[PDB]
């Protein structure tokens, strides 16, 4: 999961075809669990503050079940999409928190997704 | 640089063709600056300790010039290669340190490489 997720989120940010892979298809389904309202808001704060800030905060909320987890991957994916490819974001940090929160649900996420 | 490097190192670890990209070619040249002796040693300690450990340490040495930087990318790349694709390594951490050390030489690395 770890590697796949890093590639997915990154791809979702620059859309570079050469780093695309059909597994993204299934992951992209999770988008549904996330309201484009929140995403839009988040994006706005990120640009208001010129920072990872807001996103890092959302990634720090708790995750008590696989649904929680899926949502967090989704919110990362959409932010990654809408924020811009020119955005100097230290993706390693976001991944660090994100995996800290969902690492444990990886096995089940695999199953649930593939 | 940040994104390219994450993709390169990860690819160098599982060799998944679908995430391959010819820019890797140039980066792969840097291999030369790194002695396969060190890499082998490092790998051994990582397995002796069952951990990121050793690699994290090498990534923490200082980088005072672009040559230093290139070497560190190289050492990351070869470790990534020889360590194994089944190795549960939290790549986000290594990237965190690695970029902390070479982030500043990105622009010049681009130029020097492409």
Author numbering:
A (entry chain A), B (entry chain C): 1 to 114
The authors write:
The VACV protein N1 was first described as a secreted protein but was shown subsequently to be a 14 kDa intracellular homodimer that is expressed early in the virus life cycle and contributes to virus virulence in mouse intradermal and intranasal models of infection. Functional analysis demonstrates that N1 inhibits apoptosis both in transfected cells and in VACV-infected cells and, consistent with this, biochemical analysis shows that N1 binds pro-apoptotic Bcl-2 family proteins Bad, Bax and Bid. The crystal structure of N1 reveals that it is a dimeric Bcl-2-like protein with a surface groove that is constitutively open and that is predicted by molecular modelling to bind BH3 motif peptides of pro-apoptotic Bcl-2 family members. N1 is the first VACV protein shown to be a Bcl-2 family member and represents another example of VACV anti-apoptotic proteins.
The full-length wild-type N1 and a C40S mutant were expressed in E. coli, purified, crystallized and the structure was solved at 2.9 Å resolution by MAD analysis of the selenomethionated protein. The C40S mutation was introduced to avoid intermolecular disulphide bond driven aggregation. The crystal contains three dimers per asymmetric unit. The structural model encompasses residues 1–114 (residues 115–7 were not visible in the electron density map) and has an Rfactor/Rfree of 23.7/24.4 %. Note that the C40S substitution is distal to the dimer interface. N1 contains seven α-helices arranged with a fold similar to Bcl-xL and other Bcl-2 family members, including viral counterparts. Comparison of N1 with Bcl-xL using program SHP matched 96 Cαs out of 114 with root-mean-square deviation (rmsd) 2.4 Å, and revealed secondary structure elements representing the BH motifs of Bcl-2 family members equivalent to those in Bcl-xL. The predominantly acidic surface of N1 contains a surface groove formed by helices α2, α3, α4 and the N terminus of α5. In contrast, the N1 groove has an open conformation that could readily bind BH3 regions of pro-apoptotic Bcl-2 proteins. The dimers of N1 observed in the crystal structure are held together by anti-parallel interactions between α1 and α6.
